[PDB]
């Protein structure tokens, strides 16, 4: 029922502390979200807890704010070990459709 | 002939807040020397019978309950004290007469990453009457919309974890709480001290 | 604390395949469970969820009727039976538990199980 879209779907991040991912929903989601990571051919793990909360086990660099209808994940460093998937997920209703995906380059 | 206090007070595992293992102990001689001396006991406050004269009166039947509490809200364990721990998962009756014990504990109750095995209740349809177990994970519904049995826009899982960390602070760290309850005159006294 | 899955393989288009998900450590009879699908070289999608008592079965509106899921608390396992499969089903399945708004339920995923039905 609910369909998502994340605009970039692909980006190139050289040495730089400003990398962001935009996630948008058809209907007003309030503050129900998840942002997951998936390394190449590995089981995905959490990256963000819900809307604007972190989950113990990851550095404090990752951040994300904005509720209701627009969402933006942001990072503030490189640490060249996190170039992987940045999937977006919903927790509003039973359909729970995921996002499309993302890739990170090296330039 | 000594009571199995070591089988309740000292142990490696404990229920979080709701699976509190109510152990009934009787047919023994009550000793109140190790407890009376306090030693490492953070708060020996007892509601009801005085703590000094405990080893004098012969109780009828005694129960021991154990769990872990966040600590900034340890005071909630007492008669006529509402809150979040004393209102949903462990309700103390108005006519309570037993004693409550709290141990400060960080060495054995917090891993480096942070414990996530001390769940405590978060929601319930109705307030909980005194001394009633509640072991069931059925999803709550805050709003009018029924979310069925997975989750919803206004539905939450009724078990959240404390989120312990080795540092935390003076508060917000695991305090192991054990409460002893005594029955008044159910039958001729079955446990008594020297 | 861990969880693994088994029962994958390659089969003809249209047949009954039963796959199992066994989790140890965190108690199994307290939390729901989800199955999530990831096709090769693409994003990942969701298929179905089962509650703790196995009385309610929500599915995505793409494999309704074809799939079925149940749980065995005594055996401490999750069983997914897929029948009348078709070509696009070829993907990797993960047995997971997903957090919604609170840090209570854990978020372990295992590794996965590959299944392609080209035959
Ligand atoms: C639980 O363990 C504590 C210590 O870990 C026990 O306290 C000791 O008890 C012995 C025997 O009475 C005394 O000789 C020690 O002086 C006590 N303090 C220590 C060892 O630091 C306590 O007795 C145990 N619980 C029970 C019910 O015996």
């Amino acid at each position: 029922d609910i369909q998502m879209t994340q605009s970039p779907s692909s980006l190139s991040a050289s040495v730089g502390d400003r990398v962001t991912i935009t996630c948008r929903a058809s209907q007003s989601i309030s503050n129900y979200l998840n942002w997951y990571q998936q390394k190449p051919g590995k089981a995905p793990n959490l990256l963000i807890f819900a809307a604007s909360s972190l989950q113990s086990g990851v550095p404090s660099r990752f951040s994300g704010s904005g509720s209701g209808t627009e969402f933006t994940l942001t990072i503030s460093s490189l640490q060249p070990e996190d170039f992987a998937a940045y999937y977006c997920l919903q927790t509003y209703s039973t359909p729970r459709t995921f996002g499309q995906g993302t890739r990170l380059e090296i330039k | 002939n000594l009571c199995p206090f070591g089988e309740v007070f000292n142990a490696t595992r404990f229920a979080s807040v709701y699976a509190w293992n109510r152990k009934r102990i009787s047919n023994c001689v009550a000793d109140y020397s190790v407890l009376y001396n306090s030693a490492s006991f953070s708060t020996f406050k007892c509601y009801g019978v005085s703590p000094t004269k405990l080893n004098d009166l012969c109780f009828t039947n005694v129960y021991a309950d154990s769990f872990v509490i966040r600590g900034d809200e340890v005071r909630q364990i007492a008669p006529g004290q509402t809150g979040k721990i004393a209102d949903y998962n462990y309700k103390l009756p108005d006519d309570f007469t037993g004693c409550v014990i709290a141990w400060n504990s960080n060495n054995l109750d917090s891993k480096v990453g942070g414990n996530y095995n001390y769940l405590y209740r978060l929601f319930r349809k109705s307030n909980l009457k005194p001394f009633e177990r509640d072991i069931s994970t059925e999803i709550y519904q805050a709003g009018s919309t029924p979310c069925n049995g997975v989750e919803g826009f206004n539905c939450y899982f009724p078990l959240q974890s404390y989120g312990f960390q080795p540092t935390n602070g003076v508060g917000y760290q695991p305090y192991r709480v054990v409460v002893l309850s005594f029955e008044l005159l159910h039958a001729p006294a079955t446990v008594c001290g020297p | 604390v861990q969880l693994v899955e088994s029962g994958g393989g390659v089969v003809q288009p249209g047949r009954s395949l039963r796959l199992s998900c066994a989790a140890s450590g965190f108690t199994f009879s307290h939390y729901p469970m989800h199955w999530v699908r990831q096709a090769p070289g693409r994003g990942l999608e969701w298929v179905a969820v089962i509650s703790y008592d196995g009385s309610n079965q929500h599915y995505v509106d793409s494999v309704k009727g074809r799939f079925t899921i149940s749980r065995d608390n005594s055996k401490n396992t999750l069983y997914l039976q897929m029948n009348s499969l078709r070509a696009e089903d070829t993907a990797v399945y993960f047995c997971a538990s997903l957090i919604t708004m609170i840090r209570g339920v854990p978020d372990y995923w295992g590794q996965g199980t590959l299944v392609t039905v080209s035959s």
Side-chain angles (χ1 to χ4, degrees):
Chain A
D1 196 359
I2 292 155
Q3 173 44 220
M4 294 299 291
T5 61
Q6 48 153 322
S7 180
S9 75
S10 292
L11 61 83
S12 308
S14 57
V15 174
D17 298 337
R18 288 298 100 195
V19 302
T20 74
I21 318 295
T22 55
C23 196
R24 282 141 151 164
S26 61
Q27 210 273 1
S28 278
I29 301 299
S30 191
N31 63 5
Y32 288 7
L33 277 192
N34 296 115
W35 275 331
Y36 287 14
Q37 275 188 356
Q38 184 178 2
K39 307 291 201 35
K42 298 260 181 95
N45 55 37
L46 266 71
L47 183 63
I48 294 293
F49 181 76
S52 302
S53 166
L54 299 88
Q55 196 261 13
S56 300
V58 298
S60 43
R61 56 194 188 218
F62 303 114
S63 159
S65 292
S67 66
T69 71
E70 69 275 16
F71 312 106
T72 301
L73 202 169
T74 64
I75 316 177
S76 72
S77 48
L78 296 148
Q79 267 86 27
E81 52 270 18
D82 63 358
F83 287 175
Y86 281 175
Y87 281 23
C88 203
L89 173 62
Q90 296 294 321
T91 61
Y92 202 101
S93 174
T94 185
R96 194 171 260 121
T97 300
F98 284 93
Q100 313 323 340
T102 55
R103 175 171 177 270
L104 266 62
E105 301 197 359
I106 48 172
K107 274 211 166 97
Chain B
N1 221 33
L2 197 151
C3 304
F5 273 52
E7 305 189 349
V8 55
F9 266 43
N10 296 346
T12 317
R13 42 171 281 283
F14 273 119
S16 303
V17 184
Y18 54 77
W20 47 281
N21 295 319
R22 179 137 164 286
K23 186 188 229 184
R24 62 167 263 157
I25 66 192
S26 305
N27 190 317
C28 177
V29 298
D31 48 352
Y32 284 129
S33 174
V34 302
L35 319 176
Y36 163 79
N37 203 357
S38 311
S40 175
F41 271 39
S42 66
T43 53
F44 191 63
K45 274 175 216 298
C46 179
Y47 303 101
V49 291
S50 182
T52 312
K53 305 259 180 57
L54 294 174
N55 60 10
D56 175 347
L57 279 73
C58 308
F59 280 132
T60 64
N61 293 78
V62 301
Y63 304 120
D65 291 331
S66 53
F67 41 76
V68 293
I69 282 167
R70 186 163 51 155
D72 179 64
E73 74 204 30
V74 66
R75 65 191 180 279
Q76 268 163 2
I77 301 299
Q81 289 273 9
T82 197
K84 275 262 291 193
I85 308 285
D87 204 76
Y88 281 59
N89 42 58
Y90 197 74
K91 178 65 139 152
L92 202 44
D94 287 347
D95 291 331
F96 182 72
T97 302
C99 299
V100 303
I101 308 313
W103 310 338
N104 272 332
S105 300
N106 294 293
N107 61 358
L108 186 54
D109 287 328
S110 56
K111 283 103 183 177
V112 60
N115 265 315
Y116 288 123
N117 192 67
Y118 282 139
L119 294 174
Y120 80 113
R121 190 61 61 99
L122 183 63
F123 294 101
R124 208 181 149 65
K125 181 191 198 205
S126 165
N127 218 318
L128 183 62
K129 60 199 292 183
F131 283 171
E132 272 297 355
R133 292 282 294 290
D134 182 3
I135 179 65
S136 74
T137 64
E138 178 45 287
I139 314 180
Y140 213 80
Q141 78 191 10
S144 174
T145 183
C147 59
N148 189 269
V150 55
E151 71 85 14
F153 160 59
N154 307 327
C155 277
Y156 311 134
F157 188 64
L159 284 182
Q160 165 186 22
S161 179
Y162 271 35
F164 280 128
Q165 283 194 40
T167 180
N168 277 358
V170 66
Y172 313 80
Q173 47 186 348
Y175 293 169
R176 177 180 293 87
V177 163
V178 174
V179 302
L180 284 63
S181 72
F182 319 108
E183 294 181 354
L184 188 153
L185 266 165
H186 269 170
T190 301
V191 306
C192 199
Chain C
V1 292
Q2 211 173 42
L3 74 171
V4 295
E5 55 279 12
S6 47
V10 176
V11 302
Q12 287 190 356
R15 217 73 70 88
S16 86
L17 267 70
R18 189 178 203 74
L19 56 85
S20 189
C21 167
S24 53
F26 74 87
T27 301
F28 185 31
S29 182
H30 285 294
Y31 314 136
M33 291 295 208
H34 303 51
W35 273 102
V36 65
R37 170 198 272 161
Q38 183 213 330
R42 210 59 37 73
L44 60 83
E45 302 144 21
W46 181 65
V47 64
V49 58
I50 186 171
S51 194
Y52 64 91
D53 201 358
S55 63
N56 290 318
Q57 308 155 356
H58 289 173
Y59 294 80
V60 74
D61 287 334
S62 290
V63 309
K64 182 64 70 177
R66 294 203 263 137
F67 275 74
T68 301
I69 68 174
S70 184
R71 44 199 300 131
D72 294 346
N73 291 328
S74 300
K75 276 84 171 151
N76 196 309
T77 61
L78 202 172
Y79 282 15
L80 183 144
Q81 193 303 320
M82 165 205 66
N83 207 356
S84 305
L85 62 83
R86 290 166 34 240
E88 58 262 41
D89 294 326
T90 177
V92 185
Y93 293 165
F94 308 136
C95 181
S97 179
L98 314 180
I99 68 154
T100 187
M101 263 316 318
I102 62 170
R103 209 191 279 91
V105 63
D107 63 358
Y108 294 169
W109 281 56
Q111 187 278 337
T113 301
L114 185 145
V115 174
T116 289
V117 300
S118 286
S119 66

